[PDB]
Nucleic acid binder design. Structure first.
Ligand SMILES: [Mg+2]
Ligand SMILES: [Mg+2]
Ligand SMILES: [Mg+2]
Ligand SMILES: [Mg+2]
Ligand SMILES: [Mg+2]
Ligand SMILES: [Mg+2]
Ligand SMILES: [Mg+2]
Lengths: 206, 153, 62, 118, 262
RNA sequence: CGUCGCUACUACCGAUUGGAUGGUUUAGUGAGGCCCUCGGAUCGGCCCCGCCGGGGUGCCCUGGCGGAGCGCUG
RNA sequence: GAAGCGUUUACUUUGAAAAAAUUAGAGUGUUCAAAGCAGGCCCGAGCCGCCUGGAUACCGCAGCUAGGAAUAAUGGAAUAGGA
RNA sequence: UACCUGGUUGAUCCUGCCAGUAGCAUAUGCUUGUCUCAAAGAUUAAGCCAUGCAUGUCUAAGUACGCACGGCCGGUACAGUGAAACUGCGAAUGGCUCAUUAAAUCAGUUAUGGUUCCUUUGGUCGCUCGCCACUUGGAUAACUGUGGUAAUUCUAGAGCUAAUACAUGCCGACGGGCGCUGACCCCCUUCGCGGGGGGGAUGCGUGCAUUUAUCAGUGGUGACUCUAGAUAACCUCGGGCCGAUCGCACGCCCCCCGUGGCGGCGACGACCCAUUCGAACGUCUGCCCUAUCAACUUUCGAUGGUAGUCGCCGUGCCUACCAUGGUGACCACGGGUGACGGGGAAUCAGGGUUCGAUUCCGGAGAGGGAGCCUGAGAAACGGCUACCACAUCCAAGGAAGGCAGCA
C-alpha cells in the first residue's frame, strides 16, 4: 500500500534509482487519523510486533496543564483556531500535535478560586453567592488565614491571561499526537508564546 | 532579526519559558535559561552556543542530536543552504595493478549550527556522525578551523 | 544440501612440450629401472618432488 | 448454493467470507475466500427450503409432532446441572448428574457418566 | 528471509565445536538462552562428542529426558541448551561435575571439578541500573539479573553466584593486577594479569594483559573476564593453566611425551 | 593498374507516415483490497409491568405462562 | 597517575578485529593415494580404562590502536592584529 | 620448469601476425576390465506441466458422555487405551532458481544515545486501601438426524455438549502509611496584640504500564531530553496488568474442637524489564563496458529549513509554507551487460588475465504485476483478492489452477 520507503526517491545526484524488490510490509504507511472534534471515537490498530496504536477519530475532551501554576486538569475542546503547518487544517478542525486550540477555562478557574481564594474570571462579583461567598471567606482560623495571605502575596496573573479567563476560553497547544496515542493532551499558552501566537492570529485576521 | 521568523514558535523544549515571574524577582527582562550540553570526545562547546539566542533543534550543543560513530574532516565548498553546508573530502584510492594512487573526492552535506558564525569557503571543518538529519545529511559540524587565514585584507 | 566433500587434486603434471628425445629417453630409463606401468608414475613422483622443492624454496627465501 | 441472511436479493452474489460469517469455514487462520451465495429472498428458483415450526397447529402432523427424541447428552457444567435441577448449595450436585446407560449386544451393558467441570 | 532462522549448517557452525564435515549436513542450532550461539556449547555435542556418552541425537535425547543433567543446578531437558562460559554441568548419577572453560587453544575443554567447588559460579556483570522503586538491578554475561547488589560492584566486574539461591557470595573489582581470562578473539582462552587499560571514548577500550611467562597480549575490554584476585584464580584452572605455547614448544612437548612413553 | 563483361557472397542506402518486442512515461477510464463516513438483514439484554402463583408477612421472595415496552439498548 | 601536545596528513612497524569451507601447512600407515579428522596404549581377562589431536599461516583496500619521523605535501611573526 | 617451433625471400636479418604447443571446461566421437570418491536441465526457455509425494503436531500436567475398545465390582462425576473435533503451536524455517538489480545488492567497518523483537533463560507477579469467590455467564465443535448440487478439502436447516476457546468478575492480603483538605483542640513570648509549634475530626488521590506539563539533582555514559525521584493530572468499552487454569505423591493442626484451616513438587498463563535469536534503516571505503551518452535534477520533491502526518523508530517517507539549491571531465546523467554480490575457481617467475548460475554467507522471486488477512515475524504464494497471459472440468448454471520443491 502506502510506502515509507526511501528507495523510490531520486538519489542525491538526481539520478533515477531502480527498485530491487517489491514493497515490503515493514515499510508501510496508513491513512491519517484526521482527528475531528466531537464525541469520542477511538479505533484500535494492530501495529508492528503485535502492539497497539490508538486512532483518535473524534475527541471532545483533553488533558491540559497550566504549567505556570502546575495545575493539570481535564477540560473540553472548543475549536481549533490556528495551525502552523496547514491553514486548511484550521478550517477543517483537525487536532494535530502542534496545533493550538481553544479550551474551557472552568476547571482552572475553579482551582484558582479554591487555592488563591481570589476572584478570577468574574466580571463584577455578587452573582454566584451560594458558593463564591463561602469559598472566599470560610471564616477560617488565624493560621489558615496566615497560610492564605502567604500565597496571596505571589498571586498574580498575566494581563493577557486573566482576560482570556474572563472570556472563558484559554489558548492551549497540544503536545500529544492524536492518532498515535489517541489523546489530545497539551499545555496552556503563557508569556512570549501566547503573545507570539496572538500576533499570528491578528496578522491572519484582525 | 529575532528568533521567531517562521509560522511556528521556536523554543528549547527542555526550558520552561515562563517561571511565574512576580514581584519577588525584578521583571527587568530576566534572562530565560539556555540549554547546552557537552558532547564529549574532547570538543569544547563554543561560547556562542553557550550564550546565544538562536534556536536550532539540530545543533550538536543546544539541539536534540547525539554525536556517535565516525568523526572525520572536510573542506567547506558551498555555503548556500539554510543551516547546512557541503564539504569536500579528498583522498587517494590505491589501484593495485599499477601500484599507484588516484585522486578522488566525495561531497558531504553536513549540518552547520549557527554557533559557528564566521565560517568561510576553504576552511577545514571537523564533523561528527549523528542520526539522519535530512535525506542526505548524516553529519554535524563539531569544530571549525581557518585555512592559513585569520588575517583578511 | 549434500554432505559430500569433493576435495581432490591431481597428483601429476604433464610436461610442457611433448616429443623430446632426451626427456622421452630419460623417462623410459626410469620406467625400465623401476618397473613403472606408464609415464604417469614418473610424472607423479616428479610432481611430488617439485612440490617439495617449491615449499623448500619458499622457506629458503624466508 | 446456500442462501445467506442479509443479502437482500434474489439470485446469487460473490462475497468475501471471513471466519465464522456463514456458508464457509476457514482452512487456516485468517483465511478469507470469495464464495458464491444465494440471496435471502425466496422465489420459485430454489431446490430445498428450510423451515422451522415455531407454532403448533390444531392437529398433529404425522411423523413430526410425535415420537419425541431426547437431547443426546445432558449438561456437563456444574452450573448447568444446578440450573437444570434447581440445586441451591451442596445438595449432592456431584451425583445429580445424568448418567446415561449404554447397552451393546456383545458386551456387558454399562452406565457411564461424564466428567463435570467447574 | 521472512522471519527468524531455525537451521544451522554443519560448515557454518562455530569452529570450536569440532564438528566434522562428513557426518551431517546440519549442526545443532542452539536454542536461545543465557549465552550467544557463537560462544555456547550445546548439550547434545557436549554429551555426544566431548564425553562420548551417547552415539547419536536420539541417545543424547534419552539421557536428557531421564533428567540427569543439571546445568547451573537446574535440570535442563533441552537437547540444544546453550551451556556457555563458566557453567556447571553436574551429572549426579555418575557423581561428576564439569566447569565449562576454554582451554589454551580457544575452545571449551572437559574440566572436571569437585562437588564442593561445583556449588558456586563466577559471573561478569554487564550492565548496572536502577529499576522501579529505586531498586539496583544488575545483569550478568548470562541472562541472569539480580536485585540488591553491593553498591561497590561496577560494570565489567566479577561476582560469585551461589547456586540454589541465586545470591552473591563475594565480588572482584576490575582493576590492574587482577588475574583474568580472555573470552574471544585470537587470544581466546588465555590466562593473564591485567597490566593496563587504555580508554578510547566512543570506541572499544583496549587492555594489555601479561601471563605467567611474561608474554604481553592486548584485547578489547568486552572480552575480559576477571576470574581471580591478584595472581591466584578463584576457581580450578584447566590443564596448561591458560598458558599459550607456540607451535614449536607444543611440538617438542609431544616429542618428549612420546619419547617418555616409548 | 583500372573501367567494362560473367558468376557467387557480405554488409550499406531505400518509398513502405514499414513491422515486432522490451522499458520509462503524459493524458483518460479503471478491477480489487485497505481506511473513513454511513448503513442496519438479522441475533440478544433490560424495561417484566397481560396473567397467575405470591412474600418479609393487594403491602410479590419470586417460579412459570405470556399480552408486550411496541421504549431504553448491545 | 590524572590532562594537553611545541600543526594536520601521507608513509612504515606493531596490536586488536577480521565466519567456516577452499589455499599453504602441523600431526595421524585411508592397506598407499585422492581423501578424512581421526587415532594410539597395554589386557598376563577384568584395562571393573588410560594417553591424545581436532594446530598454525595468509586474509587485500577502507576503518580502530601504539611506536618511528628519513622521504612528500602542509602551515606559525611582515602594515606585527606576534610569543 | 621465468622455454618456444614452422610459415613472406633467390637467399638474409627484422617487424609482424597466422599456425603449432600445455592446462581446464562444456559438448561430441571411438573405446572401456577392477576399485575409492564424485558433478549432473545453469547456458537456449524465470518456457509450459499430467500424476504421486514434499508440514504437520499430545504429555501425568487445556476440553472425551463415539462403544471404537475396556478395568467396572455394583451403586460410583471422572479407571485406562483412546478415533474425531475444539483449543495451542508450527506452517515466515527448509528446498529451488538467478529473471531483476551497477553505490543498488554485497564485503570489511561502525552506529542504532533513532527502533521492534515469538520463544529460551533470569527478574517481577498480597507493592494498588477499592447475597457466586468453596468458582459466574452465553455460544460452538465433534456427535444424532433432514438434505442440495454433475461437481470441490462446498456446505445449510434442527438438537444438544465442554474449556487454558469467548466473555464476566469478586474476596483476600488490609492493620494502616503518605501527600493535599483542613472542624477544632492543646502547650506557647502571653499582656492590651501578634504569637512559635504540635495533635488531629471529614473528605480527595494513592501500585506497575500509558499521555501531558513542572521541580530538584540514587546510580551511568565520551556524550541524554538516560535511569531513578517529586508534584499536578489523564489513563482510550473492537477499552493494558493486577491467575475463576491443569497433574503427582499425599500429609500437619486440632484448643475454638470434628469441619474447616494449613501445606511440597511441578505445568500452563502473564502488563513490564533484561537476555537470546534476530530483523530493519543508517556510517566510511570499494564494482564491468560505454562520450557515436556533457551537462543532469527541480511542473510531477529535485537540495535544505520550520511544523505536522504516517511508520516500530531517524529522515522529503508524505503534506503545508519558505529558500534555490543539489550532482558533474576526480566521468555526473544516460545507455549496455551473454551482470545476482562475496568467500572462492582456472592459469601459475613476479606482475597479472579470465571465470564465479552452482551445495557457505547475504539478496531477490515463486507465470507478470498489484493489494491484503492472520500472525512476533509475510506484502507469504505447497495463504487469500483482482487484473493481464496461459490452462482443467462441466449435465453450460457453475467450479477449480500455479513443480525457478522431489521424481
Ligand atoms: Mg476444570
Ligand atoms: Mg541476469
Ligand atoms: Mg555466485
Ligand atoms: Mg543461497
Ligand atoms: Mg504466533
Ligand atoms: Mg517473498
Ligand atoms: Mg506473492
Amino acid at each position: 500500500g502506502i510506502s515509507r520507503d526511501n528507495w523510490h526517491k531520486r538519489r542525491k545526484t538526481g539520478g533515477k534509482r531502480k527498485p530491487y524488490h517489491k514493497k515490503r510490509k515493514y515499510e508501510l504507511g496508513r491513512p491519517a487519523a484526521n482527528t475531528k472534534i466531537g464525541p469520542r471515537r477511538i479505533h484500535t490498530v494492530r501495529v508492528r510486533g503485535g502492539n497497539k496504536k490508538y486512532r483518535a477519530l473524534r475527541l471532545d475532551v483533553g488533558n491540559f496543564s497550566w504549567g505556570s501554576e502546575c495545575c493539570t486538569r481535564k477540560t473540553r475542546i472548543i475549536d481549533v483556531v490556528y495551525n502552523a503547518s496547514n491553514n486548511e487544517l484550521v478550517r477543517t478542525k483537525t487536532l494535530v500535535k502542534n496545533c493550538i486550540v481553544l479550551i474551557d477555562s472552568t476547571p482552572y478557574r475553579q482551582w484558582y478560586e479554591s487555592h488563591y481564594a481570589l476572584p478570577l474570571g468574574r466580571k463584577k462579583g455578587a452573582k454566584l453567592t451560594p458558593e463564591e461567598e463561602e469559598i472566599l471567606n470560610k471564616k477560617r482560623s488565624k493560621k489558615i488565614q496566615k497560610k492564605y495571605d502567604e500565597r496571596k502575596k505571589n498571586a498574580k496573573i498575566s494581563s493577557l491571561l486573566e482576560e482570556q479567563f474572563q472570556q472563558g476560553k484559554l489558548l492551549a497547544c497540544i503536545a500529544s499526537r492524536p492518532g498515535q496515542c489517541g489523546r489530545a493532551d497539551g499545555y496552556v499558552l503563557e508569556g512570549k508564546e501566547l503573545e507570539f501566537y496572538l500576533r499570528k492570529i491578528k496578522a491572519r485576521k484582525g | 532579526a529575532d528568533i521567531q521568523t517562521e509560522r511556528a514558535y521556536q523554543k528549547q523544549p527542555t526550558i520552561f519559558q515562563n517561571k511565574k515571574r512576580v514581584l519577588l524577582g525584578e521583571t527587568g527582562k530576566e534572562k530565560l535559561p539556555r540549554y547546552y550540553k557537552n558532547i564529549g570526545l574532547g570538543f569544547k562547546t563554543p561560547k556562542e552556543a553557550i550564550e546565544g539566542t538562536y534556536i536550532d533543534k539540530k545543533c550538536p550543543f543546544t539541539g536534540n542530536v547525539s554525536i556517535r560513530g565516525r568523526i572525520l574532516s572536510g573542506v567547506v565548498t558551498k555555503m548556500k543552504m539554510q543551516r547546512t553546508i557541503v564539504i569536500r573530502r579528498d583522498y587517494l584510492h590505491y589501484i593495485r595493478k599499477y601500484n599507484r594512487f588516484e585522486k578522488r573526492h566525495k561531497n558531504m552535506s553536513v549540518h552547520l549550527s549557527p554557533c559557528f558564525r564566521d565560517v568561510q569557503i576553504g576552511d577545514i571543518v571537523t564533523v561528527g556522525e549523528c542520526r539522519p538529519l535530512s535525506k542526505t545529511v548524516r553529519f554535524n559540524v563539531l569544530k571549525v578551523t581557518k585555512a592559513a587565514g585569520t588575517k583578511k585584507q | 544440501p549434500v554432505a559430500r566433500s569433493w576435495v581432490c587434486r591431481k597428483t601429476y603434471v604433464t610436461p610442457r612440450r611433448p616429443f623430446e628425445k632426451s626427456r622421452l629417453d630419460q623417462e623410459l630409463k626410469l620406467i625400465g629401472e623401476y618397473g613403472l606401468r606408464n609415464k604417469r608414475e614418473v610424472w607423479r613422483v616428479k610432481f611430488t618432488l617439485a612440490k617439495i622443492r617449491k615449499a623448500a624454496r619458499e622457506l629458503l627465501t624466508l | 448454493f446456500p442462501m445467506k441472511q442479509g443479502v437482500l436479493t434474489h439470485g446469487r452474489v460473490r462475497l468475501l467470507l471471513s471466519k465464522g460469517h456463514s456458508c464457509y469455514r476457514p482452512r487456516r487462520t485468517g483465511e478469507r475466500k470469495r464464495k458464491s451465495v444465494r440471496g435471502c429472498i425466496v422465489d420459485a428458483n430454489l431446490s430445498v427450503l428450510n423451515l422451522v415450526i415455531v407454532k403448533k397447529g390444531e392437529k398433529d402432523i404425522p411423523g413430526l409432532t410425535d415420537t419425541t427424541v431426547p437431547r443426546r447428552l445432558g449438561p456437563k457444567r456444574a452450573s448447568r446441572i444446578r440450573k437444570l435441577f434447581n440445586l441451591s448449595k451442596e445438595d449432592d450436585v456431584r451425583q445429580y448428574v445424568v448418567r446415561k446407560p449404554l447397552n451393546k449386544e456383545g458386551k456387558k451393558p454399562r452406565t457411564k457418566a461424564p466428567k463435570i467441570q467447574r | 528471509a521472512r522471519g527468524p532462522k531455525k537451521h544451522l549448517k554443519r560448515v557454518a557452525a562455530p569452529k570450536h565445536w569440532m564438528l566434522d564435515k562428513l557426518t551431517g549436513v546440519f549442526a545443532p542450532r542452539p536454542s536461545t538462552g543465557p549465552h550467544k550461539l557463537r560462544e555456547c556449547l550445546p548439550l547434545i555435542i557436549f554429551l555426544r562428542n566431548r564425553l562420548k556418552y551417547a552415539l547419536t541425537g536420539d541417545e543424547v535425547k534419552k539421557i536428557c529426558m531421564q533428567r540427569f543433567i543439571k546445568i547451573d543446578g537446574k535440570v535442563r531437558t533441552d537437547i540444544t541448551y546453550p551451556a556457555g562460559f563458566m557453567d556447571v554441568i553436574s551429572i549426579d548419577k555418575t557423581g561428576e561435575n564439569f566447569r565449562l572453560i576454554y582451554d589454551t587453544k580457544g575452545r571449551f575443554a572437559v574440566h572436571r571439578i569437585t562437588p564442593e567447588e561445583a556449588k558456586y559460579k563466577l559471573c561478569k556483570v554487564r550492565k548496572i541500573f536502577v529499576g522501579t522503586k529505586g531498586i539496583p538491578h544488575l545483569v550478568t554475561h548470562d541472562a541472569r539479573t539480580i536485585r540488591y547488589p553491593d553498591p561497590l560492584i561496577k560494570v565489567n566486574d566479577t561476582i560469585q553466584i551461589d547456586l540454589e539461591t541465586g545470591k552473591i557470595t563475594d565480588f572482584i573489582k576490575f582493576d590492574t593486577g587482577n588475574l583474568c581470562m580472555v573470552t574471544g578473539g585470537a587470544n581466546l582462552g588465555r590466562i593473564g594479569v591485567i597490566t593496563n587499560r587504555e580508554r578510547h571514548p566512543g570506541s572499544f577500550d583496549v587492555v594489555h594483559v601479561k601471563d605467567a611467562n611474561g608474554n604481553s597480549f592486548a584485547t578489547r575490554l568486552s572480552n575480559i573476564f576477571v576470574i581471580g584476585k591478584g595472581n591466584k584464580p578463584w576457581i580450578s584452572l584447566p590443564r596448561g593453566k591458560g598458558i599459550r605455547l607456540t607451535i614449536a614448544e607444543e611440538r617438542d612437548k609431544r616429542l618428549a611425551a612420546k619419547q617418555s612413553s616409548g
